[model samples]
Target: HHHHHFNLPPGNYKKPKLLYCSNGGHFLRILPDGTVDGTRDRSDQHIQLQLSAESVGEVYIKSTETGQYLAMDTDGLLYGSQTPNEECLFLERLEENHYNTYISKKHAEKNWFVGLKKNGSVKRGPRTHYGQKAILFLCLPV
Candidate 1:
Protein backbone atom coordinates (compact mmCIF):
# COMPACT_ATOMS: atom_id res chain seq x y z
CA HIS A 1 0.00 0.00 0.00
CA HIS A 2 3.03 2.25 -0.32
CA HIS A 3 5.76 3.14 -2.78
CA HIS A 4 8.46 0.67 -3.66
CA HIS A 5 11.06 3.10 -2.39
CA PHE A 6 9.71 2.88 1.11
CA ASN A 7 12.32 2.10 3.74
CA LEU A 8 12.66 -1.54 4.58
CA PRO A 9 12.26 -2.53 8.21
CA PRO A 10 15.38 -2.90 10.39
CA GLY A 11 14.92 -6.62 10.34
CA ASN A 12 15.51 -6.67 6.63
CA TYR A 13 19.20 -5.95 7.14
CA LYS A 14 20.84 -9.17 8.18
CA LYS A 15 24.03 -9.99 9.98
CA PRO A 16 27.29 -10.25 8.09
CA LYS A 17 27.34 -13.45 6.07
CA LEU A 18 30.24 -15.22 4.46
CA LEU A 19 29.85 -15.91 0.77
CA TYR A 20 31.63 -19.22 0.67
CA CYS A 21 32.45 -20.71 -2.69
CA SER A 22 31.71 -24.42 -2.70
CA ASN A 23 34.01 -25.38 -5.55
CA GLY A 24 36.82 -23.02 -4.76
CA GLY A 25 36.53 -23.69 -1.05
CA HIS A 26 37.11 -20.00 -0.51
CA PHE A 27 35.31 -16.92 0.62
CA LEU A 28 34.18 -14.27 -1.83
CA ARG A 29 36.07 -11.04 -1.26
CA ILE A 30 36.30 -7.56 -2.67
CA LEU A 31 39.74 -6.10 -2.98
CA PRO A 32 40.56 -2.42 -2.60
CA ASP A 33 41.19 -2.35 -6.32
CA GLY A 34 37.53 -3.10 -6.89
CA THR A 35 38.39 -6.63 -7.91
CA VAL A 36 36.17 -9.48 -6.77
CA ASP A 37 37.54 -12.96 -6.12
CA GLY A 38 37.61 -15.80 -3.64
CA THR A 39 40.02 -15.94 -0.72
CA ARG A 40 40.91 -19.14 1.06
CA ASP A 41 42.92 -17.34 3.75
CA ARG A 42 39.93 -15.50 5.29
CA SER A 43 41.77 -12.21 5.40
CA ASP A 44 40.63 -9.25 7.49
CA GLN A 45 38.67 -7.93 4.52
CA HIS A 46 36.89 -11.19 3.88
CA ILE A 47 34.23 -11.58 6.55
CA GLN A 48 31.84 -9.08 8.15
CA LEU A 49 29.88 -8.82 4.94
CA GLN A 50 26.20 -8.10 4.69
CA LEU A 51 23.48 -9.52 2.48
CA SER A 52 20.82 -6.86 2.84
CA ALA A 53 17.49 -7.84 1.43
CA GLU A 54 16.21 -5.63 -1.32
CA SER A 55 13.13 -7.80 -1.60
CA VAL A 56 11.94 -11.26 -0.66
CA GLY A 57 14.65 -13.09 -2.55
CA GLU A 58 16.91 -10.32 -3.73
CA VAL A 59 19.88 -8.95 -1.83
CA TYR A 60 22.99 -6.82 -1.96
CA ILE A 61 26.51 -7.99 -1.17
CA LYS A 62 28.20 -5.37 0.93
CA SER A 63 31.53 -5.37 2.71
CA THR A 64 31.58 -3.59 6.04
CA GLU A 65 35.35 -3.38 5.94
CA THR A 66 35.82 -1.97 2.48
CA GLY A 67 32.50 -0.13 2.45
CA GLN A 68 31.78 -1.22 -1.09
CA TYR A 69 29.03 -3.13 -2.80
CA LEU A 70 29.70 -6.23 -4.87
CA ALA A 71 28.57 -5.68 -8.41
CA MET A 72 28.63 -7.58 -11.69
CA ASP A 73 28.94 -6.05 -15.08
CA THR A 74 27.32 -7.10 -18.35
CA ASP A 75 30.43 -9.16 -19.07
CA GLY A 76 29.92 -11.11 -15.85
CA LEU A 77 32.97 -9.69 -14.14
CA LEU A 78 32.48 -9.15 -10.42
CA TYR A 79 33.66 -5.80 -9.13
CA GLY A 80 33.08 -3.36 -6.27
CA SER A 81 31.05 -0.20 -6.31
CA GLN A 82 30.96 2.62 -3.82
CA THR A 83 27.30 3.19 -4.51
CA PRO A 84 24.70 0.57 -5.25
CA ASN A 85 22.60 0.38 -8.37
CA GLU A 86 21.01 -2.20 -10.60
CA GLU A 87 24.36 -3.87 -11.12
CA CYS A 88 24.55 -4.52 -7.39
CA LEU A 89 21.21 -6.27 -7.13
CA PHE A 90 21.46 -10.05 -6.90
CA LEU A 91 18.81 -12.74 -6.74
CA GLU A 92 19.73 -15.00 -3.84
CA ARG A 93 18.35 -18.30 -5.01
CA LEU A 94 18.83 -21.63 -3.34
CA GLU A 95 20.37 -24.40 -5.41
CA GLU A 96 21.00 -28.07 -4.89
CA ASN A 97 23.09 -29.51 -2.05
CA HIS A 98 22.16 -26.65 0.29
CA TYR A 99 24.08 -24.05 -1.68
CA ASN A 100 22.91 -20.62 -2.70
CA THR A 101 23.60 -18.89 -5.98
CA TYR A 102 23.77 -15.17 -6.41
CA ILE A 103 22.58 -14.32 -9.89
CA SER A 104 22.90 -10.86 -11.35
CA LYS A 105 19.56 -9.15 -11.74
CA LYS A 106 21.04 -6.65 -14.15
CA HIS A 107 20.74 -9.11 -17.00
CA ALA A 108 18.26 -11.78 -16.01
CA GLU A 109 18.20 -13.89 -19.19
CA LYS A 110 21.97 -13.94 -19.30
CA ASN A 111 21.96 -16.10 -16.18
CA TRP A 112 25.20 -14.61 -14.94
CA PHE A 113 26.18 -15.99 -11.54
CA VAL A 114 28.74 -14.90 -9.01
CA GLY A 115 31.11 -17.67 -9.90
CA LEU A 116 34.61 -18.38 -8.64
CA LYS A 117 37.17 -20.67 -10.16
CA LYS A 118 39.13 -23.25 -8.19
CA ASN A 119 42.18 -21.05 -8.26
CA GLY A 120 40.24 -18.10 -6.85
CA SER A 121 39.48 -16.19 -10.01
CA VAL A 122 36.20 -14.65 -11.02
CA LYS A 123 34.43 -16.43 -13.86
CA ARG A 124 32.76 -14.67 -16.68
CA GLY A 125 28.98 -14.79 -16.82
CA PRO A 126 28.72 -16.20 -20.32
CA ARG A 127 31.16 -18.93 -19.34
CA THR A 128 29.19 -20.05 -16.25
CA HIS A 129 26.32 -22.48 -15.89
CA TYR A 130 23.65 -23.33 -13.34
CA GLY A 131 24.88 -26.91 -12.92
CA GLN A 132 28.47 -25.94 -12.20
CA LYS A 133 30.07 -25.97 -8.78
CA ALA A 134 31.94 -22.78 -9.56
CA ILE A 135 28.60 -20.99 -9.45
CA LEU A 136 27.49 -22.55 -6.21
CA PHE A 137 28.08 -20.71 -2.93
CA LEU A 138 27.04 -20.97 0.69
CA CYS A 139 25.93 -17.76 2.32
CA LEU A 140 26.83 -18.73 5.83
CA PRO A 141 26.88 -16.78 9.06
CA VAL A 142 30.28 -15.83 10.34
Candidate 2:
Protein backbone atom coordinates (compact mmCIF):
# COMPACT_ATOMS: atom_id res chain seq x y z
CA HIS A 1 0.00 0.00 0.00
CA HIS A 2 1.64 3.26 -1.19
CA HIS A 3 0.82 6.56 -2.78
CA HIS A 4 3.12 9.23 -4.16
CA HIS A 5 3.92 11.26 -7.24
CA PHE A 6 7.02 12.33 -9.19
CA ASN A 7 7.06 15.08 -11.76
CA LEU A 8 9.37 13.90 -14.54
CA PRO A 9 9.71 16.10 -17.59
CA PRO A 10 9.20 14.53 -20.97
CA GLY A 11 12.46 14.02 -22.82
CA ASN A 12 14.81 11.40 -24.18
CA TYR A 13 16.68 9.98 -21.16
CA LYS A 14 19.43 7.55 -22.02
CA LYS A 15 20.73 5.02 -19.50
CA PRO A 16 20.79 1.31 -18.87
CA LYS A 17 18.38 0.32 -16.11
CA LEU A 18 17.90 -3.03 -14.48
CA LEU A 19 14.27 -3.77 -13.69
CA TYR A 20 14.55 -5.50 -10.36
CA CYS A 21 11.56 -7.21 -8.90
CA SER A 22 11.17 -6.43 -5.20
CA ASN A 23 9.49 -9.71 -4.33
CA GLY A 24 11.86 -12.31 -5.75
CA GLY A 25 14.97 -10.16 -5.98
CA HIS A 26 14.98 -11.09 -9.64
CA PHE A 27 15.80 -8.95 -12.62
CA LEU A 28 13.58 -8.63 -15.66
CA ARG A 29 15.30 -9.80 -18.81
CA ILE A 30 14.55 -10.77 -22.35
CA LEU A 31 15.11 -14.43 -23.04
CA PRO A 32 16.86 -15.65 -26.16
CA ASP A 33 13.39 -16.41 -27.54
CA GLY A 34 12.39 -12.76 -27.17
CA THR A 35 10.10 -13.45 -24.25
CA VAL A 36 10.10 -11.38 -21.09
CA ASP A 37 10.79 -13.02 -17.74
CA GLY A 38 11.64 -12.21 -14.17
CA THR A 39 14.44 -14.30 -12.74
CA ARG A 40 17.57 -13.94 -10.66
CA ASP A 41 20.64 -13.09 -12.66
CA ARG A 42 23.67 -10.84 -12.72
CA SER A 43 23.49 -7.53 -14.56
CA ASP A 44 23.93 -8.08 -18.26
CA GLN A 45 23.00 -6.48 -21.54
CA HIS A 46 19.92 -8.67 -21.81
CA ILE A 47 18.63 -7.10 -18.64
CA GLN A 48 19.59 -3.61 -19.56
CA LEU A 49 16.81 -1.47 -21.06
CA GLN A 50 17.02 1.87 -22.81
CA LEU A 51 13.92 3.92 -22.11
CA SER A 52 13.21 6.50 -24.77
CA ALA A 53 10.38 8.98 -24.60
CA GLU A 54 7.95 8.55 -27.47
CA SER A 55 5.59 11.26 -26.32
CA VAL A 56 4.81 13.32 -23.27
CA GLY A 57 4.60 10.89 -20.34
CA GLU A 58 4.97 7.94 -22.69
CA VAL A 59 8.01 5.81 -23.45
CA TYR A 60 9.33 2.94 -25.48
CA ILE A 61 11.49 0.41 -23.62
CA LYS A 62 14.03 -1.14 -25.92
CA SER A 63 16.65 -3.77 -25.29
CA THR A 64 20.20 -2.50 -25.42
CA GLU A 65 21.52 -5.69 -26.98
CA THR A 66 18.85 -6.96 -29.32
CA GLY A 67 17.33 -3.62 -30.26
CA GLN A 68 13.91 -5.17 -29.67
CA TYR A 69 11.32 -3.17 -27.87
CA LEU A 70 9.30 -4.44 -24.95
CA ALA A 71 5.73 -4.76 -26.09
CA MET A 72 2.50 -5.79 -24.50
CA ASP A 73 0.18 -7.87 -26.57
CA THR A 74 -3.58 -7.44 -26.58
CA ASP A 75 -3.83 -10.45 -24.29
CA GLY A 76 -1.51 -8.81 -21.75
CA LEU A 77 1.51 -10.95 -22.54
CA LEU A 78 4.88 -9.24 -22.72
CA TYR A 79 7.23 -9.87 -25.58
CA GLY A 80 10.11 -8.31 -27.47
CA SER A 81 9.52 -7.08 -30.99
CA GLN A 82 11.34 -4.97 -33.53
CA THR A 83 8.26 -3.00 -34.45
CA PRO A 84 7.41 0.27 -32.72
CA ASN A 85 3.64 0.08 -32.45
CA GLU A 86 1.07 1.10 -29.90
CA GLU A 87 1.72 -2.08 -27.98
CA CYS A 88 5.30 -0.91 -27.49
CA LEU A 89 4.24 2.32 -25.88
CA PHE A 90 3.86 2.67 -22.13
CA LEU A 91 2.78 5.41 -19.83
CA GLU A 92 5.36 6.29 -17.21
CA ARG A 93 4.14 6.90 -13.74
CA LEU A 94 6.15 7.74 -10.64
CA GLU A 95 5.88 5.53 -7.60
CA GLU A 96 6.44 6.02 -3.91
CA ASN A 97 9.44 3.67 -3.99
CA HIS A 98 11.45 6.19 -5.96
CA TYR A 99 10.97 4.15 -9.10
CA ASN A 100 8.65 4.31 -12.09
CA THR A 101 5.80 2.09 -13.18
CA TYR A 102 5.25 1.29 -16.82
CA ILE A 103 1.60 0.87 -17.65
CA SER A 104 0.34 -0.22 -21.02
CA LYS A 105 -0.90 2.74 -23.01
CA LYS A 106 -2.55 0.53 -25.60
CA HIS A 107 -4.96 -1.08 -23.21
CA ALA A 108 -8.21 0.46 -22.09
CA GLU A 109 -7.77 -1.13 -18.69
CA LYS A 110 -5.42 1.41 -17.25
CA ASN A 111 -4.96 -0.51 -14.01
CA TRP A 112 -3.13 -3.27 -15.78
CA PHE A 113 0.53 -2.92 -14.90
CA VAL A 114 3.57 -4.55 -16.43
CA GLY A 115 4.33 -7.04 -13.68
CA LEU A 116 5.76 -10.48 -13.09
CA LYS A 117 3.84 -13.48 -12.00
CA LYS A 118 4.77 -16.28 -9.59
CA ASN A 119 5.72 -18.41 -12.58
CA GLY A 120 8.33 -15.76 -13.63
CA SER A 121 6.65 -14.68 -16.87
CA VAL A 122 6.11 -10.97 -17.46
CA LYS A 123 2.55 -9.85 -18.04
CA ARG A 124 0.12 -7.07 -17.35
CA GLY A 125 -2.05 -7.47 -14.26
CA PRO A 126 -4.45 -5.42 -12.23
CA ARG A 127 -2.18 -4.79 -9.30
CA THR A 128 -1.77 -1.51 -7.49
CA HIS A 129 1.62 -1.87 -5.81
CA TYR A 130 0.36 -4.32 -3.20
CA GLY A 131 3.04 -6.96 -3.74
CA GLN A 132 6.67 -7.07 -4.73
CA LYS A 133 5.94 -8.84 -7.98
CA ALA A 134 4.02 -5.82 -9.10
CA ILE A 135 6.65 -3.39 -7.97
CA LEU A 136 9.57 -2.96 -10.34
CA PHE A 137 12.64 -0.97 -9.40
CA LEU A 138 14.13 0.93 -12.31
CA CYS A 139 17.69 1.42 -11.10
CA LEU A 140 18.94 4.58 -12.73
CA PRO A 141 22.49 5.83 -12.93
CA VAL A 142 23.95 7.52 -9.90
Per-residue error for 7 in candidate 1, Å, reads: 25
RMSD of each candidate relative to the true structure: 5.4, 4.3
Q: For residues 1-142, write the lDDT of model 1, one tens digit per residue.
A: 3212222222325468788898979888887778788788765565557888888767898988888999988777889999998999987777773667877887657778889999989898888877899988876667
lDDT of 2 by residue, 1-142 (tens): 2122345533437566777666566677876678888876665558877788776777888878888888888777789988788889877776654656777777635455677665656655544333444656565441
Clashing pairs in 2: none
For model 1, the stretches where C-alpha displacement exceeds 4 angstroms are: 1-13
> What lDDT does candidate 2 reach at residue 47?
82
Point out where model 2 deviates above 4 Å.
Answer: 1-12, 126-133, 140-142
Candidate 2 least-lDDT 10 residues: 1-10
lDDT scores in order: 0.78, 0.68
